[PDB]
Design a protein around this nucleic acid. Structure first.
Ligand SMILES: [K+]
Ligand SMILES: [K+]
Ligand SMILES: [K+]
Ligand SMILES: [K+]
Ligand SMILES: [K+]
Ligand SMILES: [K+]
Ligand SMILES: [K+]
Ligand SMILES: [K+]
Ligand SMILES: [K+]
Ligand SMILES: [Mg+2]
Ligand SMILES: [Mg+2]
Ligand SMILES: [Mg+2]
Ligand SMILES: [Mg+2]
Ligand SMILES: [Mg+2]
Ligand SMILES: [Mg+2]
Ligand SMILES: [Mg+2]
Ligand SMILES: [Mg+2]
Ligand SMILES: [Zn+2]
Lengths: 99, 76, 91
RNA sequence: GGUAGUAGCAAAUAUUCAAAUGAGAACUUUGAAGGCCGAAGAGGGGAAAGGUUCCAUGUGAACGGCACUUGCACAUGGGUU
RNA sequence: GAACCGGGACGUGGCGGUUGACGGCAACGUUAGGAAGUCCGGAGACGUCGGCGGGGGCCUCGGGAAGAGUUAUCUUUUCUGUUUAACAGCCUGCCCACCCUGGAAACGACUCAGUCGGAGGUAGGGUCCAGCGGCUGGAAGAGCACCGCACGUCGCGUGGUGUCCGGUGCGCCCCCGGCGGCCCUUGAAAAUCCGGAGGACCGAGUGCCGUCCACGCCCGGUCGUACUCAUAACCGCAUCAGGUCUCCAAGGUGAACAGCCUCUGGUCGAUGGAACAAUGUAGGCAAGGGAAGUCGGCAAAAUGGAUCCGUAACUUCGGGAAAAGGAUUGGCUCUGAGGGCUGGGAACA
């Protein structure tokens, strides 16, 4: 299971730090009921505008959405951005403004 | 299921059925234990009887052979 | 276990109506709810449907009998008398 | 007429804040909050009975046992395939 | 948009003529497959109570995805929705009922309870019956949820993604099946529909006689239909705390449509403001005594659920009985017992 978080728009808007989100996901993602135990089973990789999460075992997109929402609340940008599933790709999320 | 698998015969099945209706057995485990104990006791009794009859027959044959030998000695 | 010393079927009435009436109705209660031998099919499967009506569960024959018993005592006497009269007439 | 501006308005837990309209707002409408009915209901339909009370717009007087901008009231229209 | 019913008239195709079909040992099956006076059966068609079983809806648990709520801290967590009508075909075949083979005591089969069997069980193989069962067409094009572009005054505009996979039950509402209990109580009729007994009568050779078969064609009158159904739309002289038949019925606690709290839906409608005198109305408490009060223990208080122990006289033997009289009850962490499916001593995994 591979999932991608798209933050290209906020990155271009200079309101998001891809490295910060990658660190948050690495520290908070739970493997076998324990947080931060990514190791070989779960791998989180970042890019210029996209974050990719891969796990050998089955993974839930909803958990990634919940972690991203927690990060947004922590960084005090939840009131401006929301996590929305992309129309075409079924394994990717996007951060977008709502107004 | 036991009757279908031939672990028990129809007669023992009927007896156990009547006893179950009689509230003899509280649960699965006690019924299984009782069935196993009855089968083991029956097998032990059967094998003991067979051994006793076999040894009796062997002793009778030996006695007959000895009697024939003594009769031959007497005939001389 | 012996549930009732002597009441038996009339125990449903509890302590009502008096001992004598309960004892008197015990006979009817037992007889009308009992099974009776079926002469036609040789089975104990005759049950009362309504007062005076007795049907067999096995062969399906229905007989008109006593209110609370399959055969009243006077029925046998009537049959014997009729048989005697018929034999006299035929002879 | 006196009684007399007196007897009374007291069952069914409960209202509050801001705004809008209006000559006039404790009582109309919007939003927020705090409560109640708690599925054998203060919810959602029928039978009988009623007969337009249904819906829209407007409103002098009367009535809605205080009040009303309001309405099961009044006036004009519409509605039951 | 997609179906059905009743009636009418024909045309095409199909079906029968061994004049009135074929198949199965049988239960019976197949879209068709004669027939008039006369006669016969069934459905309509029926009480009440108890257990059990099946189906539909609801409730409930888990996973996948979509959106939302919380996020000082924790929460792969909390909430919402994740749909499939009539009707047509095929499949399936509950509990019963029925048919074929066979002939049973060492009797067996069997229900929660029963019950069944030489008047033919068990067993093996079949037929039929219900379905608010399954699949497909209807039908995703619809509905719902989510994500976008556009007019931005009047396009009821335009596009995409999903609508997925399982568990569970003395759970609740409805329907059905099959047993059992009760009666000195046995718990409607008719319209209408279906089936059957009989066979008078009836036709031809390349056309005739029939045909409850399929498709095609036409028509379907009259009246009611708004609204309330009630703490103001009915009656009670009223917008009266009274009276007036019935359908639906979520979560928690709990035995429980008890009481108490909550969700959907509804609603804050009972003229308002200030004070907190006496006397009242409704609701509590009260030291010591404990009915001395009073006609009278009126009123109030006391008791109360569940589990365990225990329970007298008398008695119509059924009861009395929850007699009387005693003990326990929270929270937290554990232990033991009570099951289903699959796989050839399987007493196992
Ligand atoms: K005004
Ligand atoms: K009826
Ligand atoms: K009955
Ligand atoms: K229908
Ligand atoms: K006929
Ligand atoms: K109507
Ligand atoms: K009505
Ligand atoms: K006294
Ligand atoms: K006195
Ligand atoms: Mg009810
Ligand atoms: Mg109105
Ligand atoms: Mg009863
Ligand atoms: Mg439940
Ligand atoms: Mg669609
Ligand atoms: Mg005939
Ligand atoms: Mg009048
Ligand atoms: Mg409970
Ligand atoms: Zn008989």
């Amino acid at each position: 299971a591979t999932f991608v978080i798209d933050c290209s728009k906020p990155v271009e808007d200079k309101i998001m730090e891809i490295a910060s989100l990658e660190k948050f996901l690495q520290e908070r993602i739970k493997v076998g009921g324990k947080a931060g135990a990514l190791g070989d089973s779960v791998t989180v990789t970042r890019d210029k505008t996209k974050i990719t999460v891969t796990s050998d075992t089955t993974f839930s997109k909803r958990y990634l959405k919940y972690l991203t929402k927690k990060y947004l609340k922590k960084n005090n940008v939840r009131d401006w951005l929301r996590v929305i599933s992309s129309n075409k790709d079924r394994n990717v999320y996007e951060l977008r403004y709502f107004n | 299921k036991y009757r279908e698998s031939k672990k028990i015969d129809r007669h023992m099945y009927h007896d156990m059925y009547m006893k179950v209706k009689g509230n003899v057995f509280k649960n699965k485990r006690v019924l299984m234990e009782n069935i196993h104990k009855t089968k083991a006791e029956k097998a032990r009794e059967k094998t003991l009887s067979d051994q006793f009859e076999a040894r009796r027959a062997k002793n009778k044959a030996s006695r007959e052979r000895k009697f024939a030998r003594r009769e031959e000695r007497l005939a001389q | 276990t012996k549930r009732t010393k002597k009441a038996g079927i009339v125990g449903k009435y509890g302590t009502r109506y008096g001992a004598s009436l309960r004892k008197q109705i015990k006979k009817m209660e037992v007889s009308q709810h009992s099974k009776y031998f079926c002469e036609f099919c040789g089975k104990y499967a005759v049950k009362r449907k309504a007062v005076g009506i007795w049907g067999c569960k096995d062969c399906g024959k229905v007989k008109a009998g006593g209110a609370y018993t399959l055969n009243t005592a006077s029925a046998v006497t009537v049959r014997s008398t009729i048989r005697r009269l018929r034999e006299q007439t035929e002879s």
